[PDB]
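Predicting holo structure, estradiol bound.
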Amino acid sequence: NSLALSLTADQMVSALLDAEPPILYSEYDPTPFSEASMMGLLTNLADRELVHMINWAKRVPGFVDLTLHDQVHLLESAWLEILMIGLVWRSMEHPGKLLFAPNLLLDRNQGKSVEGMVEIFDMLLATSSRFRMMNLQGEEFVCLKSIILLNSGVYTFLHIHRVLDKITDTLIHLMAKAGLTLQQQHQRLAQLLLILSHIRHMSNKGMEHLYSMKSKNVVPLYDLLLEMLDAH
Amino acid sequence: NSLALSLTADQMVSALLDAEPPILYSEYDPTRPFSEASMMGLLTNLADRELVHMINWAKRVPGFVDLTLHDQVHLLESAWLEILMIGLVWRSMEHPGKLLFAPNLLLDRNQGKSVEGMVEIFDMLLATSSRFRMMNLQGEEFVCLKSIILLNSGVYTFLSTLKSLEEKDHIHRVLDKITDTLIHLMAKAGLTLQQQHQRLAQLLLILSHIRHMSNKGMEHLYSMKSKNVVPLYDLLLEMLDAH
Amino acid sequence: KXILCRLLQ
Amino acid sequence: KXILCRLLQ
Ligand SMILES: C[C@]12CC[C@@H]3c4ccc(O)cc4CC[C@H]3[C@@H]1CC[C@@H]2O
Ligand SMILES: C[C@]12CC[C@@H]3c4ccc(O)cc4CC[C@H]3[C@@H]1CC[C@@H]2O
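Done. Tokens:
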């Protein structure tokens, strides 16, 4: 089976760092936010990012080995978790702020601009503080994003596990090479995986938020964004 | 600080096995028509009772009581359903295709169709159950998982005083301690170092799925509460209002 | 308006 | 509707 199962931890990391999508800039500059202008800004950015995301998924070892149907199902199920972790990751060096784009750094308050938005902002920020605190590494980050893509919809399914194990192997390798003890390795591996179920949770609230914003007719009906939204 | 941080893997396991809540029996009437309103009353009645025992169990999980009353409330409001669910999947392990809500209440996928949007959730629960069976999850492992849920679920959703920082700090120390315990169980079972990491990962990954099932279940419960098919159980309603 | 803290307190 | 299966194509 899969060629991904015969990569060395270092090859694996290399593949993942390679597949990284570009960091998009917001295609408008706020400069007073408004519920409709804010949702159009964030939503505009997300829609674009989804195109690059699809390209990225095709480069994660073992992903393309799945059927078109399973591939579709995996992305529909994790697109937001993936947008979110990408967000928290680049927001690491910006205490109390969310760096949606190099040219769009918002903070908790501007989150008040939209209904039921601040809570989600706070959760994201908490995740970002946690990663900062843990001194998450880029090599670790791309392993986490891949575990999310592959692990999110697998039991909502009704090879993947082999690839997940491989990725766990890689994370331990990174941790070992960094000098952590066997105990510190397991603990950190657990701490990172645990943060994942929180990102899952933020994703669920996010879906509900995005869906309500649609009802309120505040969000521009982007084709791909909506399809992903309806998937659930 | 906390006495929980000076327990040995074996004392830790002992503590959790000791804290285990009693397995309740459903208190219903079998001679009543299966209907959206009767089913919801059955599951919802059971859940409400289990929450009282759940609160007792939490007080016995090492490190829990060291938290402020406010943090204790938060954690439980944020994990009560994941906990009811993991408990469900656990005692449903030895019952392929069925969910053992109670020793006298074993339902299957099809009796789930009895309620709107319920079957999907049943399938997820059953899927999880199958996964645990497949993995041959142990009771010692099970209690370590349930505790990780109680402590990990709402920690990234606290607030922001100096006090809260010490709290989150404390929680993470207990979580690490519990990870130590899982590995210890796995090593003693004879798994290699690699098998240990992989399993630890597999189990923790299942937790995010349980979190997901929890979110759907909340939405479902809340909707059923709009259709007016949920009895006014004081505790359950409170825990459901948390979100 | 307070069931959980009672049982907890 | 369907856009995803094509992009992955
Ligand atoms: C989906 C939402 C708009 C798009 C936001 C976004 C957009 C781009 C991105 O890279 C990350 C995130 C995280 C939070 C998302 C929001 C959660 C609520 C809102 O509806
Ligand atoms: C909350 C629900 C009723 C109570 C159910 C229960 C009740 C007791 C228990 O030990 C586990 C579960 C799992 C699924 C729960 C259901 C999910 C949807 C439904 O509204």
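Chains B and D do not touch (no CB pair under 8 Å).
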